[PDB]
Amino acid sequence: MKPLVVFVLGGPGAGKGTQCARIVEKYGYTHLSAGELLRDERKNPDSQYGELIEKYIKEGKIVPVEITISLLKREMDQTMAANAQKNKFLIDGFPRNQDNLQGWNKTMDGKADVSFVLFFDCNNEICIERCLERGKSSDNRESLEKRIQTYLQSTKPIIDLYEEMGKVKKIDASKSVDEVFDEVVQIFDKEG
């Protein structure tokens, strides 16, 4: 009964959301979205970390990663307490940079194993248009272009580190939802 974690990496528009939902359905992973857990903790009344988060906001300071790690760990402990068999976790929105990942490795050593990392990779333009189309059918180009470049700059040392561990599963995210999922099923049927 030790939690297994798969970090999902890729810029905005890389098809993370649709593949995560498919992995949850087929393999019974629990999907954790670090960005969502932080926003809910910030809003929810008398949340564990709501008033701490507001200190940082009032100060104009970054919310420390230690809070994000604590939220991810709490979600994993509650999932497994409620059902000892749901030991598999898909985490997106984390880690964003190598300092975040170092905080994870230092704090969660002996509490969780990172099985592998999914890297949804395709050219900037496909990612930019998916985000624009999504926005249209419900950011401008130059905002998305900037977020995609800073994200890939930020996560390159994370990718490099997991390559050295042999733990990167690179996906061609340029393909259609069903072809990307076929690549995902190959990885998850193998290790999973």
- Please say whether the dihedral angle defined by the alpha carbons of residues 23, 26, 27 and 29, taken in this order, is positive or negative: positive
Cα angle for residues 9, 11, 15 (degrees, 5° grid): 80
Is 141 marked within a binding site?
Answer: no
DSSP 166: T
Is 190 marked within a binding site?
Answer: no
Is 14 marked within a binding site?
Answer: yes
Closest CA to 177 of 114, 140, 125, 126: 126
Is 88 marked within a binding site?
Answer: no
**Ranges of H-type helices in the chain:** 16-27, 34-43, 50-59, 65-82, 98-108, 124-137, 141-164, 177-190
Instruction: Please give the Cα distance from 114 to 105 (Å, whole number).
Output: 10
- Which method was it determined by? X-ray
Is 192 marked within a binding site?
Answer: no
Is 3 marked within a binding site?
Answer: no
Q: Which residues 6+ apart lie within 8 Å of 43 measured at CB?
A: 50
What three-state secondary structure class fits 183? helix
Q: Which residues 6+ apart lie within 8 Å of 14 measured at CB?
A: 120, 121, 122, 127, 173
Is 134 marked within a binding site?
Answer: yes
Is 147 marked within a binding site?
Answer: yes
Is 63 marked within a binding site?
Answer: yes
* Resolution as reported, in Å: 2.1
Q: Which residues 6+ apart lie within 8 Å of 136 measured at CB?
A: none
**Token pair listed for 99:** 């300092």
Is 17 marked within a binding site?
Answer: yes
Is 11 marked within a binding site?
Answer: no
Task: Identify whether the C-beta of residue 66 lies closer than 8 Å to the C-beta of residue 6.
Answer: no
Instruction: Please give the Cα distance from 134 to 137 (Å, whole number).
Output: 5
Closest CA to 188 of 3, 8, 14: 8
Say how many CA atoms lie within 13 Å of 99 toward its Cβ: 4
Closest CA to 42 of 60, 17, 68, 77: 68
Is 136 marked within a binding site?
Answer: no
**Token pair listed for 67:** 């809070």
One-letter amino acid for residue 174 of the chain = S
